[PDB]
Design a protein around this nucleic acid. Structure first.
Ligand SMILES: Nc1nc2c(ncn2[C@@H]2O[C@H](COP(=O)(O)OP(=O)(O)OP(=O)(O)O)[C@@H](O)[C@H]2O)c(=O)[nH]1
Ligand SMILES: Nc1nc2c(ncn2[C@@H]2O[C@H](COP(=O)(O)OP(=O)(O)OP(=O)(O)O)[C@@H](O)[C@H]2O)c(=O)[nH]1
Ligand SMILES: Nc1nc2c(ncn2[C@@H]2O[C@H](COP(=O)(O)OP(=O)(O)OP(=O)(O)O)[C@@H](O)[C@H]2O)c(=O)[nH]1
Ligand SMILES: Nc1nc2c(ncn2[C@@H]2O[C@H](COP(=O)(O)OP(=O)(O)OP(=O)(O)O)[C@@H](O)[C@H]2O)c(=O)[nH]1
Ligand SMILES: CC[C@H](C)[C@H](N)C(=O)O
Ligand SMILES: CC[C@H](C)[C@H](N)C(=O)O
Ligand SMILES: CC[C@H](C)[C@H](N)C(=O)O
Ligand SMILES: CC[C@H](C)[C@H](N)C(=O)O
Lengths: 256, 256, 256, 256
DNA sequence: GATAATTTTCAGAATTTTCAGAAAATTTAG
DNA sequence: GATAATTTTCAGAATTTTCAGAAAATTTAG
């Protein structure tokens, strides 16, 4: 099986995965097939995001490591020292992925470490190990496709979660500014009587006890409703039902 | 220059690009440098998302294509019928990326087509062109790997686009439900006289033409600001400035 | 000389330094006196912030390192691996501060590495080396006073520069919001004709060419003057003299 | 517990505190834990910046001191006369930190005084108290090193305080120069009727009492907002809300 | 000393704005 | 079907606000 067929095999997993997310465990399996290696996709903090082992599964430490979803904290930082792709690493090296204890079974073992880069920084590490054979250039080509692609699926993940928080801050800010002076004070006193995420209270009485017009309170709520900060429904004599959908709202209110 | 050298060059563009969006015009010329080819990155409908050419620029048609940001209609169809990679296409084949009229300069021209796939569907096509040298398998490895990542960035963009159009619909609806009856009527008329995405008008004047209280207009606008549907700016004696941040708002409002 | 007298010596340098800043070179000298060692105060990126060497000055690499204001980039990252105070490190170790080349002169050499911590993260490293003798606990007490104190003078420096940028953003924002719609457009057209940091222009003519009232322009400038964004003086027939004192102002204006 | 163990404990509080400001109440009890002492951190004028006591809390006077956040006037003087560290002070010496009346519980009490020095001047005093055990030299090493860092955090705070009062003066002056003659007159009267740091008043009413155009008042307030001297809030029919962010503004204005 | 050129100041109207409160509309329980 | 309890809607006045522009004030050159 030629390199083209191996690259074609890997590139097919990505071109046909439904959705946008790519399962790194699926990737780990594919990387093992076309190269016959034990695969480890670890984070910058060592969290195991993918794995496709066989010979290593035969070690006690490795089993307890897969359950921890982590790797030796000390060995995690040593992978950070590899800034370029270092291949063909024997068992007599510190960067070997195989247990130095069971050296007899892994005497001819060779280890290669690919760094995962994205957006201009370090994102993870892709460690591949073999029991005897060595790594050639055709293997480093396949491994660098993975690191470059994994870093892209991580760069998207980190970026998408930043966009989410950035929108919530805008939604809260977009709402806090649309409030009037009397409407900010109204919202402060309501969330006080409400106490929790959702509840039921009589807005009118809260308006009378505090000395704020009743329509000023209805006005503030409808603005927060428009901004997606809360959901509200009327219950007539029972009162007004409120369900906060953005918790950080109040915290940013007094801050204003 | 070995394949592992060309591969490392391409991956470097992707791992260090700032932000998240990868510019296809950068990819195209990067693909062109490492393979010594004329590069086209086109969509299903033949829009040139990115290109980096040299010899082809000595043809009249190629220039007007770049001006139109599109490729011929006839050619776009025949690219869709290419369901797999097809390399070393001669000048006399319809799938050739070189103008046949300039045969004196393109008689020994070879052109390979790489379908761009993402999420299991055809997103576009990556076309490479050479004047003399044929395409080896080490070239198909790059072109196929570049079409893969190109499909990944398109898959991602189309997803973020859909998420945004959905967040917008939600913003409009959430803001329309916040409007009372008289408030919902003012906005219909305010946005009628505005005539465009943004403008300046005298609200109190429009309030008297229809017979709605001016206070109604002020509160309604302030509720659309809470949902990020419009930006509003008071110019006192000169009127009110209104910039709409959601095209489809007015259309959606009329539905109700 | 007892430890109390050594601690008293060090604590005097800090209690009597005039001003708020503490010169790390002065510190380097004091740390060398009370312990008789070659002192290195390096950053997280290896930048030498202080030094008090003697025996090492006798090496060619060290001389070229002091001029670079840096240390071997590779050795800089290895110091990051020391998370706790590691002392009594022989020349046969990678973390030795002495040149492994001139091993014969530094055979009994012992090296100690103190990490500089502040605010909850790593800030630098304090490396001490000896030619023969070893380190005791009384030496680690003195070295940890230094690391803890150096980290405090660095935490203050980093914090003070953050407070400075945070105020400039507020000054610009505090000003951009106080501007009216017509006053923002006025400031946009003035900085256009101005071209550079400071210059001379006739505001009236700029007002007439663009179609904005002349007093609207005087009003915008006086607000920016109040916010410290610009300095302005009148020159009657010659025009108005403007000197921008905050460059990022305009960049944040169109962004609004 | 060795000195190097006690030292490492204190440094840990300083290296991991969040922000920049170190809370002296944390330092005091930390000093108390590692040396088994009653701790007082007082200024020149005897204000208890921080304390952590146990046995002393069984005395009436000590409690009222904590309530007053001050120490006796007579005792504060005698601490200033202590120009150097003085350890193992008996119960019958005026420099004792223990109430003589409770002699039955404090007859074998020992108390050491550590002057707190920063920038070459006396900033405060660190006082430690014990019921039985005397103070060794390993204790003077901690108390002297704690007084040093305490002096460092006071030196820093007093500097940031002065920089702020200077930035304020600049903000006031810069804002006053931005005011015209009629504008400068309105603010004098507006701030006269306000009577306090913040309040609500009817500007247009105050405009007619004096005979100034209402527009003048609006623009003047908007110029003080640009310099961060006040916050202003429009309440329409109810009036204008004004919060002053710079106490000394009104005073400084009257000077002109 | 005075003209000429901008630059500021000041005054005033039109519009925008926030709040009050009475009438309308709703929900819940009967 | 109807009372009672809040909840919304709507209308209206008082105040705040932004802009225009004419008169005043300033600087520069003579
Ligand atoms: N698409 C995709 N992304 C993944 C997968 N596994 C992990 N990630 C992403 O990888 C990113 C980093 O991994 P973390 O969950 O943060 O693990 P960690 O222990 O916190 O390590 P650090 O990210 O370095 O802090 C996360 O934001 C995930 O979105 C996966 O299987 N598929
Ligand atoms: N990252 C990135 N995406 C791009 C670039 N140019 C185009 N795209 C994406 O390519 C996709 C198609 O480009 P369009 O310009 O919309 O072309 P089209 O005619 O709509 O193409 P069809 O998808 O066939 O309908 C969209 O998802 C774009 O976001 C580029 O330079 N960078
Ligand atoms: N008080 C004081 N601070 C210093 C001294 N030398 C350096 N610093 C501070 O140490 C901080 C970090 O050093 P840098 O100038 O940033 O050196 P660098 O090469 O950029 O290394 P990094 O800070 O890790 O990025 C700076 O912000 C300085 O303010 C000194 O002699 N006295
Ligand atoms: N970091 C820090 N500084 C503090 C703390 N308590 C007081 N200070 C500083 O200690 C100094 C004096 O405290 P004050 O409360 O002003 O006492 P004082 O009576 O003015 O003292 P004198 O300086 O003698 O006039 C000031 O610079 C304060 O900022 C604290 O808990 N943490
Ligand atoms: C997978 C980690 C490997 C075994 C590494 N050599 C260690 O001992 O931690
Ligand atoms: C890019 C278009 C190519 C050259 C096509 N064969 C044509 O003749 O138009
Ligand atoms: C000061 C650096 C020392 C000599 C280190 N062992 C190196 O060789 O880089
Ligand atoms: C803290 C004050 C001490 C106890 C002082 N000697 C007194 O008697 O008041």
């Amino acid at each position: 099986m030629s390199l083209l067929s191996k690259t074609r095999e890997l590139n097919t997993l990505l071109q046909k995965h439904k959705g946008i997310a790519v399962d790194f465990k699926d990737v780990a399996q594919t990387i093992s097939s076309v190269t016959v290696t034990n695969v480890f996709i670890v984070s910058r903090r060592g969290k195991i995001l993918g794995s496709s082992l066989n010979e290593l599964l035969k070690s006690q430490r490795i089993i307890q490591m897969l359950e921890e979803r982590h790797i030796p904290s000390e060995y995690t930082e040593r992978l950070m020292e590899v800034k370029q792709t270092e291949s063909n690493i024997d068992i007599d090296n510190v960067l070997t992925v195989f247990p130095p204890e069971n050296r007899e079974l892994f005497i001819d073992s060779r280890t290669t470490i690919f760094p995962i880069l994205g957006g201009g920084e370090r994102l993870g590490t892709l460690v591949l190990g073999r029991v005897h054979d060595d790594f050639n250039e055709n293997d480093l080509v396949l491994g660098e496709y993975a690191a470059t692609v994994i870093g892209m699926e991580i760069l998207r993940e980190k970026h998408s979660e930043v966009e989410k928080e950035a929108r919530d801050k805008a939604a809260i800010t977009m709402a806090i500014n649309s409030l009037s002076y009397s409407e900010k004070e109204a919202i402060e006193h309501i969330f006080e009587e409400l106490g929790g995420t959702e509840g039921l209270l009589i807005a009118s009485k809260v308006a009378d006890r505090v000395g704020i017009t009743r329509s000023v309170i209805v006005n503030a709520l409808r603005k927060l409703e428009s901004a997606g900060v809360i959901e509200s429904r009327s219950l007539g004599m029972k009162g007004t039902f409120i369900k906060v959908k953005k918790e950080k709202f109040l915290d940013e209110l007094e801050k204003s």
